[PDB]
Paper text:
A novel cytoplasmic dye-decolorizing peroxidase from Dictyostelium discoideum was investigated that oxidizes anthraquinone dyes, lignin model compounds, and general peroxidase substrates such as ABTS efficiently. Dictyostelium DyPA is a dimer, with each monomer exhibiting a two-domain, α/β ferredoxin-like fold. In solution, Dictyostelium DyPA exists as a stable dimer with the side chain of Asp146 contributing to the stabilization of the dimer interface by extending the hydrogen bond network connecting two monomers. The active site of Dictyostelium DyPA has a hexa-coordinated heme iron with a histidine residue at the proximal axial position and either an activated oxygen or CN− molecule at the distal axial position.
Since earlier studies have shown that peroxidase–CN− complexes are a good and stable mimic of the peroxidase-H2O2 bound state, we recorded the UV-Vis spectra of Dictyostelium DyPA at pH 8.0 in the presence of KCN. The absorption spectrum suggests that the binding of CN− leads to a change in the electronic state of iron from high spin to low spin. To understand the binding mode of H2O2, we crystallized and solved the structure of Dictyostelium DyPA-CN− to 1.85 Å. The asymmetric unit contains two copies of the complex. Though the binding mode of H2O2 and cyanide differ, the position of the carbon atom still mimics the position of the iron-coordinated oxygen of H2O2 during the formation of compound I. Therefore, the position of the cyanide can provide information about possible interactions between Asp149 and the iron-coordinated oxygen of H2O2. Superposition of the Dictyostelium DyPA:O2 and the cyanide complex structures shows a minor change in Cα-RMSD of 0.13 Å. The cyanide molecule takes the place of the O2 molecule in the DyPA:O2 complex structure. No changes in the conformation of active site residues are observed. This is different from the situation reported for the BadDyP-CN− complex, where a change in the location of the aspartate side chain was reported. Our O2 complex structure, as well as the CN− complex structure, shows the Asp149 in hydrogen bonding distance to the proximal oxygen of H2O2, suggesting that Asp149 can accept a proton from H2O2 and compound I can form without side-chain movement.
Residue numbers in the entry:
A (entry chain B), B (entry chain A): 1 to 306
Amino acid sequence: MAQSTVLPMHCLYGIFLEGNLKIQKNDQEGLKKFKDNIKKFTLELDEIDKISPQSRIGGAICFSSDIWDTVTKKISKPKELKSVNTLSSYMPGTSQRDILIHIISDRMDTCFKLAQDTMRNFGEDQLDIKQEIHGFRRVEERDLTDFIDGTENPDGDELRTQYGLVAAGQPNEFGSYVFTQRYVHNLKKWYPEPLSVQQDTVGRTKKDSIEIPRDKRPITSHVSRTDLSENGKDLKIVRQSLPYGQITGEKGLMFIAYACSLHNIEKQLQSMFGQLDGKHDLLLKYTTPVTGSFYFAPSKKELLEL
Amino acid sequence: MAQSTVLPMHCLYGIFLEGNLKIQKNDQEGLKKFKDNIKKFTLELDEIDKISPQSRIGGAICFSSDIWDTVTKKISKPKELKSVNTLSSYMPGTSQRDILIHIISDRMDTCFKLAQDTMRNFGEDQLDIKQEIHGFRRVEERDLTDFIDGTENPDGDELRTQYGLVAAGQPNEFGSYVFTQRYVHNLKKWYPEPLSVQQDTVGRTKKDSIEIPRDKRPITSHVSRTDLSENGKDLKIVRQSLPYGQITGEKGLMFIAYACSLHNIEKQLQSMFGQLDGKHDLLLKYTTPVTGSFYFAPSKKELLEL
Ligand code: HEM
Ligand code: HEM
Ligand SMILES: [C-]#N
Ligand SMILES: [C-]#N
């Protein structure tokens, strides 16, 4: 019932396409073609899944709050959805776009095939793509900081449904709030740091990702910043982030998170970027966000009924 | 034994690193460090192969004619090796570099790990990288023209040794001449051509890559330009080219060929670029080379004995 990028784990490749919708709100014939291209996407996802089961293909199309009422008059807007540009007073790199297409695979050839076919269907007259990122998993699932990324990511269908998807019975059930943020790593600055500095920064050990005990790690460590609770409930999210970039050029992390509630993501951003207690995540001394957007990925039914 | 990028077929990923050596001919300490890093490269290739046999990993380090005497006083220079910049009067995009590192894999994570570890070993104090390309195989091994690439590539160890490696008993036996050339495709010019025009351009059928008879295709079809013989012997080469690039940006073919004789490659370039009969390859109406370099990949024994 959900789109197919939230529940599956450990994809090896991901393609991220973000951009703006060039169709006008009154252009009903253009919007009808746009919605037929959406149906073509869901149909091609299904076909690749049957032809290439080893790809474990997944895909989602997601919409911003500013474009929501252009694309639909039938589906009510998700209650928390807003522009990420409202965070620009304290978080750098905000760049709210209309539309995200996120495709995951264990093979680049099928990842690329779906992305290419989809972009050819929509075309330049419907989508103005601002960013196209080819993400790939590294050996031992390490981020380019060379720490393992994913240790405390929710595991399994039950937990990823609980934390990643709007609850059954709620408006927009089985959709998901989405946050994307491209980071550029300063590895010339990070590589020379002593191991104790690197482990203080992240809050886990480098080799095995063992948690540093709370009383020995700084309150500004990354895991101290992002492991948050409210009323005894953990504000967990489902991350699908992947490394990207050139060894000899610009590189970093293509961050993406799916969540049952946008609040779970936004409170972590307030924590990392100094809005909760005045203090910033230590990781931000070594990496910089240069894009950012909020979206909602509808359930499969609501996607097809926009 | 050869380096390990010539004989294996059908790699799914390739990383191409081309650039210039920053070590002076008079720096014996720097040259000894450089050669220790070459040794580390060959040791890591062997280690990845034992740990990840499913990667089918391969790698080669290759040297230009300009840099040959800087890196060795012991191995004689290959008899045909020269700078590709000597073709600049008729072939666009020439950009001769000192060094090529070519790594191939069936998994991007191990391809990238070897490429990144190698670049960190050499460092920016030894190598100035001018181009880093991440190539990937597409579905059905099709070039971005959507024709299958590789149908007449020599198959199996026997033929790829014969055409890809210097013959046993010759100077530099089991090394290979190498040519790299990055193409940028103009798919907006190509896609609207009818199938009849596309098949005339390549010289094979699109769906099944069946050869169109020589008397029914233009002399400037790509197959007529490149299927060459002299004195009854075919001028075959071993191609390892891969697509690369962004769907919404610059994309094309990262061409690379290995040959037992540089003449086999250069005669095909003269053919394609109008130097033999004044006529250009039809494929060049739709794609443009923007880089180019000639190198020699020594045998594994001459590589370690530089
Ligand atoms: C440069 C960007 C980032 C890097 C390199 C990075 C890396 C990591 C690493 C290495 C871990 C520890 C292993 C794990 O449990 O996954 C981690 C944990 C985590 N990260 Fe990030 N991260 C980044 C940005 C973000 C952002 C922007 C958020 C939130 C919006 C976030 C949320 C989390 C969460 C929730 C955890 C798990 C914390 C826990 O409960 O223990 N990260 N990150
Ligand atoms: C944009 C660049 C290029 C594209 C898209 C391209 C594509 C192709 C295709 C589709 C084929 C037919 C299938 C096959 O037998 O592999 C082919 C054959 C071939 N290509 Fe290219 N090619 C390109 C550049 C080059 C260059 C620069 C050379 C030589 C230096 C070359 C040498 C060959 C050879 C030798 C064959 C096999 C011909 C035969 O014996 O039948 N190609 N190419
Ligand atoms: C953290 N992705
Ligand atoms: C032709 N590669």
